[PDB]
Amino acid sequence: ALANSVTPAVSVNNEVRTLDNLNPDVRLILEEITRFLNMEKLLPSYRHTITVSCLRAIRVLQKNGHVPSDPALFKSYAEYGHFVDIRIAALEAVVDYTKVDRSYEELQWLLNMIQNDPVPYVRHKILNMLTKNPPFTKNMESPLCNEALVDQLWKLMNSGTSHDWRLRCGAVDLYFTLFGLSRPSCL
Amino acid sequence: XXXXXXXXXXXXXXXXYQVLREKAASQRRDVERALTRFMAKTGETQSLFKDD
């Protein structure tokens, strides 16, 4: 419900970057989500589900321009040695971050972690909700997939995906979304 | 009665149910924010803004 307290119209001109210690109730919401994140860091009660809701709240605050659009917290919670739900929420967050913001480097890291991790289900759901929440949208290509991302996605369909069938099935879903029934307008 | 007789003293009644549980929940909030600040400034820290 704190995440459903979307207030997108505070930053009129530049209020993103520790100007006001942004005000007035957003700071109280930040106090409460800080308290619950540190309690579940200390208490933890059942799967860090409070931490999942807090990370969704932190992404909604990044979508409203209060906390700036920085993936580094979500990057540090998409790491290996956490619970499945924490990692899957941070990966949903960074997929939507790559959708809205033009972060190409975190997409490159995301594809490299699709190649390199031992857990199958996080790859499964990265591909699933990357298809559900797509960046680089077909015939809207401003962030220039044609440069080398078509080549690396074609490689990740061909090579490095002999592990499971469903990972290249999700990559088939990726080319369904990304430049589906045509050439990718490269040559 | 000021010299001969006496009485008895208790000197402590409040008996305010909603006020008592407001005080209890405020003390719980204080313990939450105190331990929050303690291990916030103690251990490994990544912030929301730059250098919070």
Residues 6+ apart with CB under 8 A from A129: A91, A92, A95
Residues 6+ apart with CB under 8 A from A77: A51, A55, A86, A87, A89, A90
Q: Which chain A residues contact residue B33 at CB under 8 A?
A: 31, 35
Residue indicated by tokens 């190409």: A104
Q: What tokens were used for A182?
A: 């045509």
Smallest Cα–Cα separation from A124: which of A83, A92, A77?
Answer: A92
Q: Which chain A residues contact residue B48 at CB under 8 A?
A: 30, 58, 67, 73
By what method was this entry solved? cryo-EM
Which secondary-structure segment (H or E) carries A124?
helix A120-132
Q: Which of A19, A26, A38 to mutate to test the interface with B (most CBs of B within 10 A)?
A: A38
Angle formed at CA A162 by CA A82 and CA A85, multiple of 5 degrees: 20
Across A141-166, b (16+ Cβ under 10 Å) vs e yields eebebeeebbeebeebbeeebeeeeb
Asked if B36's CB is within 8 angstroms of A67's CB, the reply is: no
> Strand ranges (DSSP E) for A69-155?
none
Query: 3-state DSSP call for residue A4?
Result: coil
Window 14-33 of B: residues touching A by CB (8 A cutoff) are: 32-33
The amino acid occupying position B40 is A
**Which region holds residue A18: left if phi is over 0, alpha if psi is between -120 and 50, else beta?**
left
Smallest Cα–Cα separation from A41: which of B48, B33, B40, B26?
Answer: B40
> How many Å apart are CA A33 and CA A97, to the nearest integer?
20
Q: What tokens were used for A105?
A: 């480097």
The amino acid occupying position A137 is T
Q: Which chain A residues contact residue B35 at CB under 8 A?
A: 38, 42
Q: How far is CA B1 from CA A51, A91, B11, in A?
A: 67, 81, 20
For A7, counting Cβ atoms within 10 Å of its Cβ (0-12 exposed, 13-18 middle, 19+ buried), the class is: middle
> How many Å apart are CA B16 and CA A84, to the nearest integer?
46
